[PDB]
Amino acid sequence: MREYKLVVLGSGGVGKSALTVQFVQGIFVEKYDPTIEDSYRKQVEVDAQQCMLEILDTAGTEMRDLYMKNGQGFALVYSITAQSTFNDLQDLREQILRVKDTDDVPMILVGNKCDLEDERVVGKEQGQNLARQWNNCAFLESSAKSKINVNEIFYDLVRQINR
Amino acid sequence: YEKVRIYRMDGSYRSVELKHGNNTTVQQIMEGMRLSQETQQYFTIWICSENLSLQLKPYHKPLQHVRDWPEILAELTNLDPQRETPQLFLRRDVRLPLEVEKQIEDPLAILILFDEARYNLLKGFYTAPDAKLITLASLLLQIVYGNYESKKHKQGFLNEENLKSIVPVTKLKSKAPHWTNRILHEYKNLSTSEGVSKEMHHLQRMFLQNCWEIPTYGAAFFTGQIFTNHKVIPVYVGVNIKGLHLLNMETKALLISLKYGCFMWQLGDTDTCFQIHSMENKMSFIVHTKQAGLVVKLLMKLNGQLM
Numbered sequence A: 001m002r003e004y005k006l007v008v009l010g011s012g013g014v015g016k017s018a019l020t021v022q023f024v025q026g027i028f029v030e031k032y033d034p035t036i037e038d039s040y041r042k043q044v045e046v047d048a049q050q051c052m053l054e055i056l057d058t059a060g061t062e063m064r065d066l067y068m069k070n071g072q073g074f075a076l077v078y079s080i081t082a083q084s085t086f087n088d089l090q091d092l093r094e095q096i097l098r099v100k101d102t103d104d105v106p107m108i109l110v111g112n113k114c115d116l117e118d119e120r121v122v123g124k125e126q127g128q129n130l131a132r133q134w135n136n137c138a139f140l141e142s143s144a145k146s147k148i149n150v151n152e153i154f155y156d157l158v159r160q161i162n163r
Numbered sequence B: 001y002e003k004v005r006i007y008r009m010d011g012s013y014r015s016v017e018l019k020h021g022n023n024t025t026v027q028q029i030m031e032g033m034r035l036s037q038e039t040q041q042y043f044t045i046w047i048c049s050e051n052l053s054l055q056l057k058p059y060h061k062p063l064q065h066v067r068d069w070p071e072i073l074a075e076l077t078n079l080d081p082q083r084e085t086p087q088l089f090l091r092r093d094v095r096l097p098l099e100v101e102k103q104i105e106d107p108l109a110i111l112i113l114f115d116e117a118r119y120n121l122l123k124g125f126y127t128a129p130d131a132k133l134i135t136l137a138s139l140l141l142q143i144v145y146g147n148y149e150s151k152k153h154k155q156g157f158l159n160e161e162n163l164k165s166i167v168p169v170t171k172l173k174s175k176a177p178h179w180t181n182r183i184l185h186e187y188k189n190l191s192t193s194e195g196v197s198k199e200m201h202h203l204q205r206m207f208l209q210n211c212w213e214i215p216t217y218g219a220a221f222f223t224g225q226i227f228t229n230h231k232v233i234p235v236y237v238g239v240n241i242k243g244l245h246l247l248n249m250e251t252k253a254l255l256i257s258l259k260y261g262c263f264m265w266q267l268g269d270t271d272t273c274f275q276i277h278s279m280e281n282k283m284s285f286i287v288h289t290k291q292a293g294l295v296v297k298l299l300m301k302l303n304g305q306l307m
Ligand SMILES: Nc1nc2c(ncn2[C@@H]2O[C@H](COP(=O)(O)OP(=O)(O)NP(=O)(O)O)[C@@H](O)[C@H]2O)c(=O)[nH]1
Pocket: A010, A011, A012, A013, A014, A015, A016, A017, A018, A019, A029, A030, A031, A032, A033, A034, A035, A036, A058, A059, A060, A061, A112, A113, A114, A115, A116, A142, A143, A144, A145, A146
């Protein structure tokens, strides 16, 4: 069983923790507890293989360089509710490319909180638009709350890492 | 700020700000977690290195125990202080009554208790008949692999690789290979059973219910030695809410298991051994360990709790 070091990144409040905890624990985190740094472990099956995921859940408002050096795959999370969270993702992407010193980094753009369709500031099209600008990146709209596209985030990263 | 990692048995952790540096208490650390009171009441902070695990109390300052670890090791054990750096873990409270644990509905509390239970099982700390061990294995298959599929699981699935994640390590070789058919059968039975909720916390709770009957469930383990033409046998001394249990240290074989009210203890004046008198028997034995005092304090406490 291969080990996969995954890192969830993005600005404060986007639902990095909510997504992770939903994926690993099948629980929806209601309260907002700003994260320092959490690590979770979960065995999954991606493409007929057992994988051990170690998932690092990072602080939004915050050792970043270290995470990027160590991580194999990066979930880049914004909230469709909050425009600045989307804006911030360009720098993270460019930092990761810098630190890893390569274009070819397993990576997914994740538009979270797709259950607050009402409060949606960021559009789905801008989402998908951003991802193509990023070397035909992967893109998902997700909800930690509704359990939509939660697992796919992580499986997609495994696949990419395996490529 | 200063911060610390609080580990769990599965190797996960959560970072917690130390408001008061190395003066931060267990209490304040428990607060810094993302647990409610419907979670926090079941668990506390332990300090563990490879050969010594201690439950800390609310007023303890854990980082001071990390600091003082070489002196603690030297006081409580005979080990090599160079090999042990301790870490802090969130684990079940050894004082948690079984009756209270049966109350638990909270999914987070269930999975935390579950992860710890699973850890103990795979390490060989739970002694139970093969039937029970097989049930537990089938539940972990459901839990970890999901629904049984004839295609995927019927044959050449449970090699030693897969078996290792579902059976005690102490049985992986001698007994487990013979089990593989009956595990799959109960696994299949679980999957197709519509009377068995496949909700994670429900399946985890079932696993636990099976563990609740195992004599060593929720035991704190200390180390010491017994003497049997006098031969030294290193032992784990397991103290839980049910009583006291001796494991052969090497095989984790269950040597004796005594319920509270069926045995008496006496602390050596030296504080380095204790005697157990097994009433409804002519049985008595003496355990040598520098943990003798902790062991006896804990016996008294957990005996004291029964009503
Ligand atoms: N409706 C809805 N609320 C969500 C969703 N994801 C997160 N939230 C809510 O958003 C808040 C913040 O989420 P959280 O996971 O703590 O965000 P984070 O990205 O981990 N924050 P930080 O960077 O500080 O660690 C919480 O109240 C959480 O319940 C989602 O998919 N849908």
